[PDB]
A paper describes a structure:
PDZK1 is a multi-PDZ domain containing protein, possessing four PDZ domains.
The high quality of the electron density map permitted unequivocal assignment of all amino acid side chains. Fig. 4B shows that in the crystal, the IP peptide (yellow) of one molecule (B) interacts with the peptide binding pocket of the PDZ domain (green) of an adjacent molecule (A) in the asymmetric unit, resulting in an “infinite chain” of head-to-tail molecules. As has been described for target peptide binding to other PDZ domains, the C-terminus of IP (−6IAACSLC 0) inserts into a groove formed between the β2 strand and the α2 helix, and the CBL formed by 14Lys… 20Tyr-21Gly-22Phe-23Phe-24Leu that connects the β1 and β2 strands. 68His (α2), which did not participate in the SR-BI/PDZ1 interaction appears to play an important role in the IP/PDZ1 interaction, forming an hydrogen bond with the side chain of −2Ser. The crystal structure described herein, analyzing the interaction between the carboxy-terminus of the IP and PDZ1 highlights the plasticity of a given PDZ domain to interact with the carboxy-termini of binding targets with very different amino acid compositions: -IAACSLC for IP versus -VLQEAKL for SR-BI. The structure also highlights the importance of the last three carboxy-terminal amino acids of IP, responsible for the majority of hydrogen bonds formation and hydrophobic interactions between IP and PDZ1, a function that could not be assumed by a farnesyl group.
Residue numbers in the entry: 5 to 113
The structure:
């Protein structure tokens, strides 16, 4: 499956509505527990998605704290490039260069 670009917006007094996790023996910055009615929910985030980029910044190899800090530094809007859990785990298995993944697609019909 393709990565997706999710554009989240929130107000002061709100959160985006998900947890970012590192899990034992699991690769990637994991999105977990999408809160009902949240910006994350509205923006198409899914449990098990990995965050590849935050506002264009490649974060797959960054430490958890630095990924969370980039979210904080983004303020009340943030663009996430995410990849679903199955596609991410297949990509790592297949030695796909995650840095080259982009949403741009174009086919002639």
């Amino acid at each position: 499956g393709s990565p997706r670009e999710s554009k989240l917006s929130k107000q002061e007094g709100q959160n985006y509505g998900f947890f970012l996790r590192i899990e034992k023996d699991t690769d990637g910055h994991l999105i977990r527990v999408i809160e009902e009615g949240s910006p994350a929910e509205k923006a198409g985030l899914l449990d098990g998605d990995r965050v590849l980029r935050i506002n264009g910044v490649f974060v797959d190899k960054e430490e958890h704290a630095q990924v969370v800090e980039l979210v904080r530094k983004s303020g009340n809007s943030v663009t996430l490039l995410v990849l679903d859990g199955d596609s991410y785990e297949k990509a790592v298995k297949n030695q796909v260069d995650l840095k080259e993944l982009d949403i741009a697609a174009c086919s002639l019909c």
